[PDB]
Each structure stands twice: as structure tokens, then as C-alpha cells.
Amino acid sequence: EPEPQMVLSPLTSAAIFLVVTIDSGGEDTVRDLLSDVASLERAVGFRAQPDGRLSCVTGIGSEAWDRLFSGARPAGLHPFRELDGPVHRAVATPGDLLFHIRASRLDLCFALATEIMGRLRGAVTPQDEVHGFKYFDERDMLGFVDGTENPTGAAARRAVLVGAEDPAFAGGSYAVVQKYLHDIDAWEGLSVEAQERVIGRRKMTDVELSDDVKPADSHVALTSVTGPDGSDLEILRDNMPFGSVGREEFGTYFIGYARTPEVTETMLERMFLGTASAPHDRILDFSTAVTGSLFFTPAADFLEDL
Amino acid sequence: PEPQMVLSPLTSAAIFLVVTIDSGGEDTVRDLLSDVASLERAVGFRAQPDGRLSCVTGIGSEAWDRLFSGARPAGLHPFRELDGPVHRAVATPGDLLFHIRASRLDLCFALATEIMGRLRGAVTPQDEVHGFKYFDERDMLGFVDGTENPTGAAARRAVLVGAEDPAFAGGSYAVVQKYLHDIDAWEGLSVEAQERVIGRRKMTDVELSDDVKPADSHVALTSVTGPDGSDLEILRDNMPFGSVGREEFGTYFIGYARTPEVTETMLERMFLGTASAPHDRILDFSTAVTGSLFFTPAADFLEDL
Amino acid sequence: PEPQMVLSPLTSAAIFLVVTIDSGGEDTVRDLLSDVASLERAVGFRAQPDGRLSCVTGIGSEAWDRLFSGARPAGLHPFRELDGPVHRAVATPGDLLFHIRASRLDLCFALATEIMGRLRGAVTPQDEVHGFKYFDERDMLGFVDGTENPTGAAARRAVLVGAEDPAFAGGSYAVVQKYLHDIDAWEGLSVEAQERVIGRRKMTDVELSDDVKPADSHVALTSVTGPDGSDLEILRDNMPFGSVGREEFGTYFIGYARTPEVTETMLERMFLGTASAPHDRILDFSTAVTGSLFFTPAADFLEDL
Amino acid sequence: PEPQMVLSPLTSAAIFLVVTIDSGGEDTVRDLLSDVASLERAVGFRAQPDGRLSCVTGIGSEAWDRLFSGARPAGLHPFRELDGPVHRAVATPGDLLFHIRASRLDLCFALATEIMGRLRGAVTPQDEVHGFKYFDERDMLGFVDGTENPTGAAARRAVLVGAEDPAFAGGSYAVVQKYLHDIDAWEGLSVEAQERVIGRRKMTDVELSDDVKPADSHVALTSVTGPDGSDLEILRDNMPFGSVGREEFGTYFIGYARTPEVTETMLERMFLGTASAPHDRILDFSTAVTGSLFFTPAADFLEDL
Amino acid sequence: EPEPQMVLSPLTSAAIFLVVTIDSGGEDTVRDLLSDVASLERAVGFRAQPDGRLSCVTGIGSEAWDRLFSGARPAGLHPFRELDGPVHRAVATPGDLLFHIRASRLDLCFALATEIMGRLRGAVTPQDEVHGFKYFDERDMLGFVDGTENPTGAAARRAVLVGAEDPAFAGGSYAVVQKYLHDIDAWEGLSVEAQERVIGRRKMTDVELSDDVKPADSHVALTSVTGPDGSDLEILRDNMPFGSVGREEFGTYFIGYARTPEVTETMLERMFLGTASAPHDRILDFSTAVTGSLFFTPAADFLEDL
Amino acid sequence: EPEPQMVLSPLTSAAIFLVVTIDSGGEDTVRDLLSDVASLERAVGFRAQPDGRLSCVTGIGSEAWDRLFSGARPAGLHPFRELDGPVHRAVATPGDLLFHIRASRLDLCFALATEIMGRLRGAVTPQDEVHGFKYFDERDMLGFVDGTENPTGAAARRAVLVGAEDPAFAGGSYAVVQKYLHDIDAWEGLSVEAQERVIGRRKMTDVELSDDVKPADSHVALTSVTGPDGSDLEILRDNMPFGSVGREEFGTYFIGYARTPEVTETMLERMFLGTASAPHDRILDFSTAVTGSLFFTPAADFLEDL
Ligand code: HEM
Ligand code: HEM
Ligand code: HEM
Ligand code: HEM
Ligand code: HEM
């Protein structure tokens, strides 16, 4: 049985997201580090038993996969697909390796990131680094509770882990990342009731709007997708807030895990390109994506066996 | 099948709500049942990771027949009043049970508010108790309460319906009784005399030897063996409650079991007695003022309505 | 002079008990008053360092005359009923107040049990509320409640009797009112309209600017400048309480001040209005169902009798 | 088969008790063994949810034959003394092991008190150590200790007896050794020299790379592969202990494994060395003063007595 | 203003009590350590802020004082006085220095004890070392809540700290220590109600027995002492449980702080020698003192300025 | 009478440091914000009682003081003095207003910073923003415990608050800030013993090196200063780590409070210009100051009485 990485684990109060590209000639250094990442996680993490909750999920992009490995590839691994809507665009930006590092304290995340990057210096170029923090009662920078309808238990396993559809890569997952910045000035121009209509849930109490008042171009409406067989298509989101007050940067770092990119891409298409009933997701009128990358997060034993 | 959170541990706060369904309110109730898990997530997610909010929803026998057209769970029936020579276990109205737990009362109250907001005009409240942890898991009689609950696999076996009733697998049966205690009488006993009523040491919670443990002690009467030698177990999530001004010192009893027959066997022994015991001595200091039985279906049963 | 714990912060749990003294109950009460500090330590020491148990004991005007001869506190009088054009602040009976707080309800309940056990047959309960923290220090209207309470030296100056009444230095005066809210009406307002009722932003708790704050908003009416230009302040320890099944969503108001005149001035503005404001708009959603005044003596007063 | 809590994590407090069984003590011991799980619950339930009390009970080779008729676990034998050219792994008496862990020492102490109370007059104590967490999971040599323990499925595979000995499935083997350290000699080494003794970086706990890791380093010598190319793993629940007055700075070693052969292989490598290492350098600063081997049966084996 | 040592600080969950004698010729070593002890306490303690709560209170015995210092001695400092009752005895045992180390965790206590003893090695001989631990809800090994009637606030300051009566030593205090071992076998044979009559309070609830039921030879009656002024004489007790289950050692480590030894001495005299109304304190029928020592704990500035 | 700002408060797990300049014409907006900052601190902080521990200390620079206020100036207020050593330089950088925001959680800090900067938009220009985090057991990025010798209690009050020497500004303090970046690659090539000789304390245990082995150019030797009266000159440090792993930015944000800037300036002179026995503080061989500013932090009531 393949052991997954920690893709099913819960939100934490601190996170570091690091995205790098692999420099020409840096492949051997990267493969050696991949084989040791679990050992590094334990080395740091054991220090803060029992409440540290340190984990690291490592993802590899399509272009990078083909530079690192030979043989079969995961069935759905491709570069992030840029979505060029009439109004809003989802950009593709460079990224070969993702390290999604979580803990209950930032120091543990920082210590592990330090160890990883120490091993990679001179082999990679950093592309993005975000230090995420919990904001009040699991809110995002738009002031709404964010993560509520994540799947749990068996449903999460079924939504997130590769299975018999791609048996050589069972136990893996696909992660899509996008860094979003928000236009807080425009957002705060809206009444609370108008913001609720953009999201599709009540702001303070986080209760979903009734189907009779929920707009068709609300975020919740557009990201609710059912498959041809009537099943709900779900993803697991580990979004974190971030920002810088003096630069007026207020962001949401989006990261979504799913057993095939087709689920997450369907959601993104609905948001950016719209449906017969909605031109686009109204959340995008206040949110700009500035990065966009797709990664395969292999089963943990795949990494170990390097 | 995914169960509701019937296996989850005791918490520091709880709200127990029992309502009856008004004639005409059935549709509203089915709508609400389909959404209860949603509402739980809406409130609970706000307080990850330490909130530990849960809600277990149960449905009574008469309500079942009013709400659903298909098969009935095999063990589902009205609570059976037990008319003992001295003490009585009353059967009181209740169609729907919401057993709400969290580490803080606010989460319980917020969720209860949302549930009741959806049911207003469809149901009549019968009982509402706000329970609280009392020191080191003590009840209002001063004893640790819940010690011999089953855990892990033993709990699953004792609590969850399985292949004996396969269309309802993952469900469970809850019996509730609200008890009020006569604390004046109880406090007139010595500690040793109280230990003989319960069957355990008061301060340390160690079981009395079989040599010393009276036949009519509570632990003796609620220890039941099956014909296959094995102990019959239930999972109890009792909480204290009360009002000092009204001299109300209570234990809210709630017991979960894979069949009601187990919890009914224990109640029979308590109230009706055995060869060796007229009745459970705990009932000399405890009066049951409610009594209701519910089936708590698997979570996917409620979602699919 | 050692004050009672009138300056201590909000806690997550409280019990408020208000009783009247039966005729012939005086001596039993006096004996209890002399022991209440001892009882608080008896229970509270069990939960050091985090229990934070306290009990503040207050005595009403009529009761004062029944219990004690000699000097009366200068400001002590029965709560004054306020009969406004639309809203009324009722005066209800109460001779003794016990304001019990802790970080856990069990500690409060244990202490209340001890106190009432010592008073049984000498007093009659008038009110009992069990308050709980609601999210991030919110009240049942959904606003952060207590923000502008004074701290440090400013609190001491606002709350404790000093040289103006030297025999009773270190005392304070408490006004209590139990309020029930009309949540259905309140929830009919937009958040922006709610903010204009209160005078602060709802989610972020920032005060509205003076150019937008309505004259009949709550913050506007309860901001009162004294003879010297400075704000007259009180210390509020309001707690939410309620019952979902009875649709009872409440705020237990308790405010401490060095003279009742401050609190009474605020009440008059709220209920009777001013030239600028008909009445406090919070009262269009909030009904007072009790109203009592108490003097809370210095701790050494109680210890000596 | 329900295992005892041999797979559970390190805790901040522990008591290790080793005793021998006196003449005629067998019946008393068998009665205790049947009740030990009940005693754990008695104490443990008091400190839900965070007490994390557990007790693992082990029985030695000679004791097994005195207590039980019928089959013996395949791997149970007396601890094998190893007399190396420089260092010795001593064997000392021990019939019963109690490995008691919790998040607080009180819980461990209370359970140990109850156990020893039942055994008074039937057993002679041989060793008692009260262990405590030291900073960030450090040992008395200043190194993080426990990092490479197996977890999850790998831990089950490494620790629990399976189909190779089916009557005893769910059991495990525990080896204990009390080590005292020469802290003066240790503190005479540079940090970098200490890291070469252990095989990991001192502050950050990162393993030295293979190019730099000495062959007589502790991590090198206790890394063993079976013929399959499989890593042989044990689960260590080591705790620091000591007495400053007596200059007693210790490590209480306890390691669980599915067969004693794994742990014995490691001890042989440490004490007797390999082709490339005379002995483990950790032993130049560490002296074993006890050594015993126990079998820890499945929990239901004990309950069935 | 004299700065006291942490003699007013509350009970903690962990404690080490160390008593040593000063070997011949060890005086200079000890004086240097005394000047450094606050610095050692910060060196260890700062690592664990804000919740470590580490403190160390250093005391010096009467004989040791004369060996260490010339000039003024504190007025109340003398060797502990042996009390030879008809039945029970309070023994006097050697002790020149006391270290009363407290924290929320035993590691901090142990680390600081280690640094202290490492500096005193070869200059001192250990006489006693006890590792105390909190037992449930502030109970002692007899199962009673212990510490309830300790003074707080200004009442504690008045009771504990030397003031104008000995101005050269203002902000000091006096500590008496006794290690007690209990006969738990005998104690656990009593009914709870009989135990309550020994102590003077309710066992489970910790409420004081009323005057009309409390026995004259109960512990609470014998340790309640009114001064000339008709006011209560008070001490501050930081008693901790300790023991070893194999040796049947179940102990109370008594430590009591007071502004003058006369207060603690009066209490001990009542307990061990009794009154007109009581032969002795019934607690002593289940408790044997095996050490007894008296220390002065100077103001912190005294130690640093030597 | 005078209530200080929270300059005596302890270290917390999270901090934001914001330094801004006041734009031409920004003065009135700033004065209005200064009068409201306490109300904003309460608006956010009350939400998180009792464990949020939110505070904000507001400082004003020398040039800004004269732009903002008429009448008396604090006696010690002047621009930060650049120190140009032979090897190392302490740079002076622009800064009119300092907001030192601390809490147990970063969200509270970020929320309050957001409210302050929202009021100042168009009136100020940000110069520096640092989000500090606790690193293990109060360590800095050099791996040493940092803060140990801070004064406490009465000694802190005396070291930090202005008193009768400047009675109009009694209850204020002076803050010096410097953002340091560390050369961790160079630092990590030193043995632990060599690092200990740079700092002047044992790395793991934080015990001070004895006076025989402590190098005269060690950090602790150079920042140990006695006044003419023989007494130690003390400051209160609230230094926090910060960093970005991808940029290899590993920093110490230095902030030191004192009753007069002369104390802190003497320390800086010793560090940067050295003594007869030490060319400069060895810590500076691994640490570069990239900001340097001096602020007066007035009593709370001074800000309010605007
Ligand atoms: C731009 C920043 C984003 C923000 C601030 C945001 C915020 C939210 C919020 C507040 C909710 C409702 C509560 C919850 O269930 O989590 C929500 C739901 C959801 N979001 Fe987003 N979201 C963002 C981007 C995305 C993206 C890019 C996707 C998909 C690619 C996505 C997929 C979802 C899904 C599947 C749900 C659950 C809908 C349901 O089944 O009820 N979100 N998000
Ligand atoms: C006044 C109401 C009740 C009180 C205060 C109470 C209290 C207790 C206490 C103190 C114990 C011993 C510790 C423990 O194992 O939990 C106990 C055990 C138990 N009670 Fe009750 N109980 C009550 C009602 C009931 C009822 C109505 C039932 C069953 C219908 C029940 C079933 C049990 C069971 C099964 C045990 C475990 C006995 C054993 O296996 O040792 N109890 N209860
Ligand atoms: C229905 C009952 C009440 C509710 C729900 C309520 C709620 C609030 C809220 C939300 C605030 C703003 C935040 C704060 O500073 O605490 C506030 C402020 C205040 N309330 Fe009330 N309150 C009630 C009754 C009263 C009463 C009866 C009094 C006085 C007799 C009073 C006096 C004050 C005062 C003095 C302030 C501070 C105003 C300022 O200076 O900004 N409140 N209340
Ligand atoms: C003498 C006292 C002992 C001390 C202080 C000690 C300390 C340590 C330390 C610091 C580590 C490295 C971190 C870790 O992975 O836990 C380690 C690893 C280990 N120790 Fe020891 N140990 C001792 C005795 C033993 C004994 C007696 C055994 C086996 C019979 C043992 C088996 C192991 C194993 C298997 C590892 C993991 C090696 C690896 O796979 O990396 N240790 N020990
Ligand atoms: C590179 C920036 C800095 C780092 C990493 C740093 C680190 C340290 C460390 C590790 C200590 C020893 C433990 C302690 O007592 O806090 C220390 C002490 C000290 N530092 Fe620094 N420091 C730095 C800059 C400064 C600056 C700029 C000053 C003064 C202007 C200063 C003043 C002090 C003082 C007064 C002490 C206490 C000395 C004693 O009395 O023992 N430090 N610092």
C-alpha cells in the first residue's frame, strides 16, 4: 500500500509556501534532497512533539518531472493552463518544485524551510515565498470564513488521492497554487449584504445562503460542480492569508488538492470563463491571481525510494 | 456507511434539545435534517482546532412513522415506562433529539440557535439542558462518571448497528433520561455508605471488591453478561446540570447502544430489580423526570433526504 | 482598605444570584457574609492557577437597614424606576447580589452551591443567570461588548469609593438589569443599520466617526462628560445568557461605579432621552425585566461582621 | 487481539517500576494482572481529555512459567548479559515491568500507588525511576532523542507480534536498561566531537551525511538491515531521570520490538562492536546498571485471567 | 526600596528542594555562587518565558551565616530548635544552604539545580534533595487540598517580609523546612469523616468545619494562632508532595515563610507540645518529621552586592 | 499621575514593526491618528482577551516632533547619530513615527497595523515593515537565547522610564531601532566554541562565560557598561527574529528602550568604535545594520490629551 504525503491533514495556524525553479545542472542535487525531505521533516518536527504539527508536502511540476525522472509519468501532469477570460485571466507562472510547509508555529516552518533551501542553494532559483497566518476564526482577507466545505474522512480520501485510475502513481495528488491579491478598497465599498451575495454565505455566521437568494455568479454557486454521474466534485483547500500593510498587499494564497487536475481546472474554468448563467465569478472582481502553477505530489514512498 | 459522531468522547459543554414535531411540520423537519451536517460545519469550522463541535441527531419511533415511508430500524420503539414497586421510569414525549457537544458552550448555543431558527413553527420544545463538566469528570453525587465506557474497537462493536440490520448499519440507539437528585438526603450519608450505593470508591474511583460490593449497588446492577459469556456494554455521555436557587441538581443520562435491548435490560434491573436486589440504591436519591428513545441514523442517511 | 474583586476582568463563565432575605433570616445572612471570603478560597484554591474564581457580594438599601446599625453608604438607595415615554426601566426586589466569575462554570456552581446551602431557609431566590462568553467577547446582538471599560488607575478612580465617603472607602455600587432581546427584529436590520444603533462597526469593533455616529446611538447616549470635561466611566461585566427553546436571548448587565449617580445618569439618558435623542435605539431591541442597585463593601467590612 | 499501549507516543512524565515476585506471590499477582486495565481507567478517566495515562505491563521469562500454564511466547528468555572487552551489558532481576506514562506525574504516581497497594507483601521492588521530559525532547547528553522512531504502519510491523506466533499476536517484547552518564567527561568534548559520537547535529537534530558519519557513531551502529535489505527498527520510549545531589544523570532505556532478536542484535553491535567499530562510543559516557527483558501480552490476555 | 527574592510567589506544579552543608574551606566558592545565583536563574528561566515561571529562593542557616559574613546578623536567625514532645519529636538536622527551586516544569528546576551544584562541587555536601510535584487539585498525600488559607496580597507581604524592625535586612524572610513522611496504610484505614476530624476541613470540598464540630486537636485548630493584637498570625506555605512507591515513601515537604521565626515556632510548639486542650496535633499520628532546618532568605540585592 | 505606554511589557511571540515618514502636509492627519491610537488598540485587542496580549507603542522622531508640536521638547530627543567605525558603520535612516506592535498572535498585530495605516494613507510614506516571530526558546537567528539580561520589576522602571530629570515628559522612554541582517553562511562555519567567544555566553545553556575566558571583544563584554557611580547601565530589549529563506534574509530586529538615549548610544559606540582593548564587537563581523532610528515614546496620556 503506498503511503501518501500529508495532503489530507488539516489547516494549521502557520504555513510557508515555497516555489522554486531548478537551474540547469541542479537535477542531481534536487533528487538527493527529495530522498531526504521526510528525514528533514522528522529532524525538526520531533523537537516540538506533541503540538508542533509540522508537515511538508513536496510537489513536482510537469517540466521538472521530465528533467528528473525517466519512465511513466502521472496521467494528468501538465503545466498549469492559462485561462484567458474576457475580463479576468488566470496566469501561468514558473515553478518546478513546491514545498507546502505547515505547523502550529512559524518557527518550525522556518527552520524546516531553512534546512531544505540550505541543501538546494546553487541548484534552484526561488520564485515565490509566502508566510501564511491564521486570521481570527479561520477568516480570509475578505473577512469570510474560508475552508468550511472541505471534505473530511473518507470523502476527502476519495476526492484527493490518486487510485486505480492511475495505479503506478496511487497515493499521489495534484496541487494547484495561485497567489491572489485583493482590492480591499473596492471590497470595502460594498455593504455586507452585497459581499454576502458575492460569496454565497453569510459573513459573520458562515451559514450558506438559501438556494432562492444565492446568486448564480456567487463564488459558492460557481465552484459547486457535479459530475456526469451526479457525484459532487470536491477539492481540499488549504488557503492561507498573507500580506504587507505598508505595501497595501492583502492576499489569499490558494492551494487546492485533488486526485485529478480536471476537477480543479473545471472549477477554474467556471470562475474565469463563466457559464451560460454567469459571466464570471464575482470574487474575481476583487481578487487578482498573480501566480499559477500545478504540481504532482507523489506518494511518500516514491520520494524515499530515490 | 459513515456514522454520526456517537463514538466521540465527553466534552466540557453540551446542549441536549428534545422537541416534538407539530402536525404539519414534517416537511420543514425533513429539510432541516438534510442540512444539519452543513450547519454543524458552518459553526464548527470557525473554532478549529479546539472547538470539537459535534451534533448527533436522533429520531423517535412515532416520528419515524410520520417522516419516512420505507423500512424501520429493527429495534426502534417508544421508550417503555417501567412501573417498579417503589420507583418509576416515566416515558415522556420526544420526536427529535439534538445532542450537541463542544469544548465551549458558545459553539453549542450557536448551533442550537441555527437549528431552532429553521424549525420554528414546526416543532414544540420539550426539554433543553445545558450541561457542564464538573471538576474531574464528576457527577452531582460527587463520583467520577463514565469510567467504564468502552473505547476503540470495543466501543464500535457495542454502539454501532452492523450486519444484523444492514440497511441501518452505522446507526445507533440513544436513550435519554433527565434525573434530579435529592442532594440533602445524599449528603446525610457517610462517604462509605455512598460508596456502597455506587460500588466504587469516591475520591479515587477504584471499583469495590466483589467481596464488599453490594448486590443492589449501581455498578452491580448495571453489570450485565450475555449468554455468550461476554459483558454487554453501552456508551454513556452523561452530563451534570443544575440551578442552585431552585435546588435542582441533575444528571442528564444519555446512553448509546447498538440495540435498545441492552440499555433496557439495565433499566429493568435498576427499576424492577433482581433475585438479590429490590432495586438500584442510586434511585433512592435520583428521580427520572424524562424518558425517551431515539435512533441516530448514519450520517449519509440524513444527507440523502 | 482591601476592595472586593470589583476591578477584575471579564471571564468566560459567571453566575449572578439575587435573593431576598426572609423575615427572621438576618442572623443567618450576617454569619454567611462573614464567611464568604473563606468559601471563595475553599473552592477557588482547588483550581489555581487558572481558575480565576471570584465572588463579589452586594447588599441592597432596605437590606442594609435590616442587617447593620450605624452609618449607611452615602449613595445607597433603592433602584429608581424610569418610566420613559416609550421604554421603562423596572425596579425589582433584591437584597443580596452574588456576582460569581471564573474561567469554568463548575467553580462558579460549586461556590454558589456552598453559599446557598448556608442560606437555605433564610432567603428566597429572585434571579439566577448562568452567563457564558460568546465568541470574541460578543453579546447576543453580535457586537463586541466591554471595549471601552476603564483599566488601571482610571478604573480604580471610576469604581472605588474614596475620601468622599471615608467609612466606606474601597466599596463600589453595582447596578444590575437583566435584558431580553428581540433577535427576530434585530436580524431584520442590515449590518449598517445595526452599526448606527450601537455606534461601532460590527465585525471590527472600531467606533464610528463623530460625523456619522447618530445622536440616539448607544455609544452616543452613554458617553457622558463630567463637570471638568472628563468622561464619566463605569466598569461593565455584561454576560450573555439564554435558552434556545424559549427564544430567550439575553444580556445580563452589571455595572460598577464609585457613585450610582453616574450609572443613573446614563440610564436616564437611555430611557427618558434628551433634547437630541428620543431614547437609546438599543432599547427598541432590548427589554429590561429586572433592575436592582447594591453596595459592594470593602472585603474587610464583611470579614469583621 | 487488542494490544496494550505499546505504540503510543512519548509523554512528559513516566514511572518505570520493576519488581520480583516473592514466594507464594503468584495468586496476588494474577489477580492484579486481571485488574490492571480497570485500575488504569479508574485513575485515567479523571484527567480526560489531556491526561494521556497508560500502563504497559510486562512479564519476564522465569515469571511466565510461575504464573501461566500452556504455551510460552516464542522469543521469551532471560536477558542475555554481554561482557564486552571494555563495556558490559549487565543482567539484573526483574519479573514484572510497569511502564506508566502520562502528561503529568500525579497520574502516574496515583496509578503506581494503586498497583503497588495490591501487590504489597507479594513483590519486592527492584527499580523505580521517575522520568521527565527535558526541554525539546532531549536526553541528558543534550541530544534530541526519539527522532527516528517508526510511526504508523511501520511501527505496527516493527513492534507487534503477528502470525509468526499467533497465540501471542498483539504482544511485544520490551528490553529495559538503566544508564548513568559521565557528564563531566561528556562536557569535556567539543560540541562537534559529541556530534561525531552520536551521528546527528546537536542543536538542530539533523543527521550527519554519510560522508562524515563515523562508523563507531551511535546512529551508525544501531542502523541494521535484515537479509531482505529491510531496516530493522525498534520503538524507544527513553526518558531522562536524575538526582543532582548524587551526580546521577541518567537515561532510562526501554525499547519495544516484535522479537527480542532485533534489540539484541543492536546491543551486540553496541557492546561487542563490528569489523569497523570496537564498540559504540556512546558507551564511553554511559554505564548500564540494570538489564531485563519482558513480554508485554495483548491486553485481552491479561483481562481473561 | 529592598527587592525581595520570590518568597511571595505562588505554588507551582514542580519544585526541587536542595539542602547542603558547606564543607570546611568551601566559603569562598559559596560566596561567589551566591553572587551569581540570580544570573543563573535568568540564564535558564528566560528560555521558557512566558510560562516557565522559574524561580529560586536561596536561604542561609545560622551557623553558615557567621562563616560567610562579618557584621550584622538578622535578629531572628538561630538554629532550628528541636522539640521533644512526650510522643512526637521535631528533629533538627544539618543544613547551611537552601535552594527552593520552583517552575511549571521539572526540567527547568533540574537544569538550574544542575548549574548551581556544578558551581558548588567540592565545596558542599548534599543533605537532602526532594523533587516535588502537584497532586491533582492542589492536594497533599493525605488527600486534602493544601495551601487554601495562605495569605495573599498585602496580607502576605506583611506576614512574610522583614521590615523596619530589622532595617538592615528589610525584604528578607525566614524559611523553616521539614520533610514529613506519612503512614498511608494507617491513614487510609480511617473513614473520610475521621480524616476530616484530624484536619479540620471537609475532604472533597475543602470547606472548613464549623467551630461547633471542629476538634481542639485538629490540625486547623492548632495552627490557628491569634497574636497579642487579637489578629491572626500567618505564614506562607509552599508545601509539595513527593514520594517513591517502591519504598512506601509518601511525603509532604513542608516549607513555611514568615517575617519572624517566632510565628512558625509557636505553631510547631502547639503541634508537637500541645495546649491545655490538646495533647498534640492528630496530624502527627500519621506524619513523621525526618528533617528540620531554619534559614534566612535575604533580599535579592543582598546576595548580588557581595 | 503619568501612565506610560506599554514599554515595560514582556516579549511576545509575534510583532510588527512599522516605521514611516510624515509627508509634507501630513501633520494634521498624523495628530488625529495619534489621539486615537489607544482607542484603536482597544478596538482590536479586546476581542482577544485574555490571551491576545496586544499592545502598540508609538514613538516620534526628532524632526517630526518639531513639525507636530509646539512648546517643550524631550531633553534627550535628537536624530540617530551615525557611527562610522574603521570597519563597521551604524547607518542613520529616515523615520518619523514608530509603531511597535506586539501580541501572542500575528493576526492581532496585522489587524491593528491595518487600522493605523488606513488612517494614515496619503499622510505618510512607509520606510520599513518587519513581521517578527519567536524562534524556539527565545533564540535569535544566530542560535543564541536573546534577552536574558533584560531588567525586570523596579530595576526596569528605573532603567526605562523618564522621571524627575524631565518632569514634563515623565513616563516616556527612548527607543532605538536597528534592522540587522546576518551572514549565516559565515556564522555557520564557526565552531560552537568560537561562536560562544563572539557572544560571551554558552550557546545551548545560555550561561554566561566566566570572566577568565570571556573575550574583551565579545558582545556581552562590550555591552556591559558601568556608569561613574559604578552601577550597570541597563536597557530593555525587545528584539525579534525575522527573515525570508528564499532571499537568504536572516535578521534580528533590534529595539532597545532606555530612560535616556545616552545609555544606548554608549553601547553602540563601544560596539562600533571599540575600546582600548577591543577594536569592535565581533558580533558585527556577522551582522550588518541596514536601518537606524531614534524615537521618543511619550506617556500614554500625552497622546490622548491631543
Ligand atoms: C480568490 C481567492 C479565494 C477566496 C478568498 C475564496 C474564498 C472562499 C470562501 C470564503 C468560501 C466559502 C466557505 C468554504 O466553503 O470554504 C469558498 C468556498 C469554495 N471555494 Fe473559494 N476562494 C478562493 C479561490 C478559490 C479557487 C481558485 C477555487 C477553485 C479552483 C475555489 C474553490 C472553492 C470551493 C470548491 C469552495 C466550496 C464550495 C462549496 O461546495 O460550498 N476557491 N471559497
Ligand atoms: C442518576 C443517574 C446516573 C448516575 C448519577 C450514574 C452514575 C454512575 C457512576 C458514578 C458510575 C460508576 C463509574 C462509571 O463507570 O461510569 C456508573 C456506572 C454505570 N452506569 Fe450509571 N449512572 C446513572 C444512570 C444510569 C443509567 C440509567 C444506566 C443504564 C440504563 C447506567 C449505566 C451504567 C453503566 C453501564 C455503568 C458501568 C458499570 C460497570 O460496568 O462497571 N447508569 N454510573
Ligand atoms: C441591552 C444591554 C446592553 C448591551 C447589549 C450593550 C452593548 C454595548 C456595546 C456593544 C457597547 C460598545 C462597546 C463597548 O465599549 O463596550 C456598549 C458601550 C457602553 N455601554 Fe452598553 N450595552 C447595554 C446596556 C448598557 C447600560 C444599561 C448601560 C449604562 C447604564 C451601558 C453603558 C455603556 C457604556 C458606558 C458604554 C461605553 C460607551 C463609550 O464610552 O464608548 N450599556 N454597550
Ligand atoms: C545509552 C543511552 C542511549 C542514549 C542516550 C541514546 C541516544 C540516542 C540518540 C540521541 C539517537 C539519535 C536520535 C534518534 O533517532 O532517537 C539515538 C538513535 C537510536 N538509538 Fe540510541 N540511545 C541510547 C541507547 C540505545 C540503545 C541501548 C539502543 C538499542 C538497543 C538504541 C537504539 C537506537 C536506535 C535504533 C536509534 C535510531 C538509529 C537510526 O536509525 O537513525 N539506543 N539514540
Ligand atoms: C546583531 C544584533 C544583536 C544580536 C543578535 C544580539 C544578541 C545578543 C545576545 C545573544 C545577548 C546575550 C543574552 C542577553 O543577555 O540578551 C545580548 C546581550 C546584550 N545585548 Fe545584544 N544583540 C544585538 C545587538 C545589540 C545592540 C545593537 C545593543 C545595544 C545598543 C545590544 C545590547 C545588548 C545588551 C545590553 C546585552 C546584555 C549584556 C549583559 O549585561 O550581559 N545588543 N545580545
Author numbering:
A (entry chain A), E (entry chain B), F (entry chain C): 7 to 312
B (entry chain F), C (entry chain D), D (entry chain E): 8 to 312
What does the paper say about this structure?
A widely applicable approach is the use of photocaged substrates, where the photocage is soaked into the crystal in advance and then activated using a laser pulse to provide uniform initiation of the reaction throughout the crystal. This work characterizes photocage release of nitric oxide and binding of this ligand to two heme protein systems, cytochrome c′-β and dye-decolourizing peroxidase B using a fixed target sample delivery system. In this work, we describe a thorough characterization of the application of the NO photocage N,N′-bis-(carb­oxy­methyl)-N,N′-di­nitroso-1,4-phenyl­enedi­amine (henceforth referred to as NO cage) to room-temperature microcrystals of two proteins: a gas binding cytochrome c′ (McCP-β) and a dye-decolourizing peroxidase B (DtpB). Laser parameters for photoactivation are systematically explored, and time-resolved structures over timescales ranging from 100 µs to 1.4 s using synchrotron and XFEL beamlines are described. We have demonstrated a sample and time efficient approach using fixed targets to carry out time-resolved SSX and SFX experiments with an NO photocage over the microsecond to second time regimes.
Comparison of these different structures revealed no significant changes in the binding geometry of NO or nearby residues in the heme pocket, meaning that only a two-state transition between unbound and bound states is observed. This suggests that any intermediate steps in the NO binding process must be complete on timescales of less than 100 µs. On binding to the heme, NO was observed to bind in an end-on fashion via the nitro­gen atom with an Fe—N distance of approximately 2.0–2.5 Å and an Fe—N—O angle of approximately 105–150°. The variability in these values occurs across the six independent heme groups within the crystallographic model and could represent either genuine differences in binding due to subtle differences in the crystalline environments or simply uncertainty in modelling a small ligand into the electron density features. A small shift in the side-chain position of Asn245 was observed compared with the ‘empty’ site structure in all six of the hemes, and at all laser powers and timepoints. For DtpB, the structure of the NO ferric heme complex of this or any other B-type DyP have not been previously determined, and thus we have demonstrated here that such a complex rapidly forms on exposure to NO after photocage release.
